[PDB]
Symmetry: D2
Amino acid sequence: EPVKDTNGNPLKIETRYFIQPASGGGLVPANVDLSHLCPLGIVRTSLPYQPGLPVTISTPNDVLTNTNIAITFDAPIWPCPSSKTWTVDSSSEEKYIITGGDPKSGESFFRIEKYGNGKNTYKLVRYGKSVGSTKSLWGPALVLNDDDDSDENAFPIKFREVD
Amino acid sequence: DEEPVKDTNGNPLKIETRYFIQPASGGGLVPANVDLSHLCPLGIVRTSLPYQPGLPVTISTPNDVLTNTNIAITFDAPIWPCPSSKTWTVDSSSEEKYIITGGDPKSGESFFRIEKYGNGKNTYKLVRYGKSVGSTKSLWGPALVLNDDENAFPIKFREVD
Amino acid sequence: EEPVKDTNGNPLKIETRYFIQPASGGGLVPANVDLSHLCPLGIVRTSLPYQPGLPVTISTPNDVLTNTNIAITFDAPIWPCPSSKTWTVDSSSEEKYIITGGDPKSGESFFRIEKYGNGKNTYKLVGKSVGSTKSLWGPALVLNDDENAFPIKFREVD
Amino acid sequence: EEPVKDTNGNPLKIETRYFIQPASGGGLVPANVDLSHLCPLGIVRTSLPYQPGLPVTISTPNDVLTNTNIAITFDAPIWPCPSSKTWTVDSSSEEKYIITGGDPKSGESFFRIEKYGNGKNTYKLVRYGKSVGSTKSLWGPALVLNDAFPIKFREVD
Ligand code: CHL
Ligand code: CHL
Ligand code: CHL
Ligand code: CHL
């Protein structure tokens, strides 16, 4: 079924959304620790009215649940020599969600799935391993859980349309 | 003239209420250091990232906020790494006359006046007693400065929801 | 009350530049203590091995003697924080970080240089001694409670 | 093709740590070139007077000779950028900044050490003739490719 934004509207590809914690403000790039400048992790900002850095969603126009999608940050400046597409840092113990993925490659494929009770609330899952969060340098950073795909340690998200 | 300052919704501005100060003329106004010689206190820059609303401010009077009256602007943030206040003030020592943080909200050094600006309703300028607030190129982008006397930096007040 | 000696066994002089080098990575340098405090600055051991530290000058309220009141002040051509380069204790913090911005003439900034353990020319800063704690940029100097002292040497800047 | 000498008049050896010190503040260090580029890093002259620089090792594709192809590589126990510590030229930039992340075995990273005017043990870096100079940048003078920045090699103790 279609993924819906905060207005209950269906999500469209090539359209800007803030990924907002459903559970501080939105999701933003920050470095994961002082050993890795590039590429960037994804942190929940502690500043309450910051909407997040907007993303666009691509499919390898509707965005459906349980389908392969790629998440790419939308930004006019990007100091790192790699892509704005989300992916998994394999090398790290933490399994941080990091930038620099290939939007066309399977390394960057996440699936949007329903989370708990409330409507328009979702989780990101990788194929079932769900996206959660861990304490890091700049705050909670998105990570891949070890998980059998439950909502226990999953980081719940909403999609707010950027106007 | 002493009429109420209005937000983007045409509603009258209230004290102790959060507003983004948005350029009326990139996103909102945010703290950043003015240059690589001064870490604290902070200047006020227009962010180049288009959907960033700014860091919210609250307005205080030494509940309505009126034009041509003494007010103090104070940033609202849960964390503040500099050892000084979130209240806007003028950096006297600098040639540029940067608007900086660390002022005393109760002291006259921090008093600005909100006045009507040129084109369009709900558009304002900040003036200090007449010396208006403009902008200059700096490290992180346009930084708010005090002018000498066209060059005013027009602003709107958006209510934080 | 005997003279403090540098790495060359020479007596320490006031108004003379020294690197404070860990006796136990490189020298001691200003860094912020955590992401909540930009200014003033803490004192961290750099992890880069050939960095000598930021030089300090020592003042007395020309010889620098052990067990006497001295003030340690960083020597740098640029200083972005709006406070002094003089070491002092951050009372407000739980960690009791040694921070910059003290008054060199005030007692808040007085440390005493005392002998440490075995080796010659090895000292500690003090009956509460200066130790170290894990922080943002590495080991940061702290005041210990009431073994854990951070041993130091003074290298003359040439 | 005579040997490059350090500040002690000793011949330079490969796989040996040297500070590259301005022959004309302190030594040469990594810093980002501007606020648009975090990685890879440029090479700036530190304004802090007693800082020796970040040490480098020199490799040849044990003596280091003038007018021969060499590669300069920073020596550090930590490196936050996802690329090499080997110096190279930023082609894409207008400024032609000397940046990190080159391949020490590839020709993109080859510089030549040549004698510089008057004083002994004073050298310049040249790329094949285009010499390495400096330009104003965010953190101070940054090394660039001209269309010369005199240097000395101090042995790390
Ligand atoms: C104002 C904030 C401030 C911050 C955040 C720092 C942070 C630091 N200082 Mg200090 N300093 C700061 C103020 C000042 N320092 C100094 C003088 C020095 C000296 C002499 C030295 C330092 C060094 C260091 C480093 C110590 C830990 C380490 O070994 O890193 C490991 C080093 C890395 C480069 C790892 C890279 C981490 C990376 C993920 C991003 C950070 C890179 C930047 C160097 C840090 C960005 C902040 C910069 C602008 C200071 C650390 C990067 C030492 C150093 O390491 O020099 C570079 C050193 O020798 N400081 C002065 C006097 C002018 C200051 C005045 O304000
Ligand atoms: C993005 C990465 C990065 C950045 C921004 C810097 C920045 C700098 N390095 Mg480098 N480095 C960086 C990577 C690395 N450095 C090094 C190794 C060294 C060495 C050995 C030395 C430097 C030094 C310097 C400084 C040279 C200019 C100066 O003399 O300042 C004057 C010094 C100040 C402290 C100026 C005070 C202003 C500053 C604290 C204000 C804060 C700035 C803003 C918050 C903006 C920063 C955000 C962005 C740009 C990252 C400058 C602070 C030299 C130095 O000066 O030591 C500190 C030096 O000796 N670097 C390594 C190898 C581990 C790196 C690897 O990633
Ligand atoms: C290495 C690069 C990099 C770093 C270190 C950061 C870091 C950060 N980003 Mg990100 N970002 C970075 C790249 C990018 N960001 C973004 C887009 C955004 C957005 C839209 C937002 C952030 C926000 C944040 C903050 C999230 C934590 C917080 O809530 O702090 C809150 C606390 C403070 C702002 C005060 C913290 C004090 C700080 C000055 C201390 C730093 C001390 C030293 C100088 C150390 C410097 C670190 C080294 C590694 C360079 C954090 C400061 C969010 C934010 O909060 O606004 C800034 C936010 O809304 N980022 C883009 C796309 C343009 C990037 C591309 O490179
Ligand atoms: C020395 C302290 C300090 C510094 C250097 C900065 C710097 C900045 N702030 Mg600020 N701030 C600082 C203190 C504080 N800020 C804030 C709250 C905010 C907000 C809400 C916002 C900013 C934003 C900005 C940016 C404005 C220009 C831009 O649009 O770049 C855009 C370009 C990039 C983000 C690319 C990254 C460039 C890269 C080379 C540097 C590394 C990125 C880091 C985010 C900056 C360094 C880390 C630390 C020092 C913040 C700029 C990165 C705006 C922003 O853009 O958020 C990220 C913004 O919306 N600031 C608070 C209250 C908590 C502070 C308290 O002290």
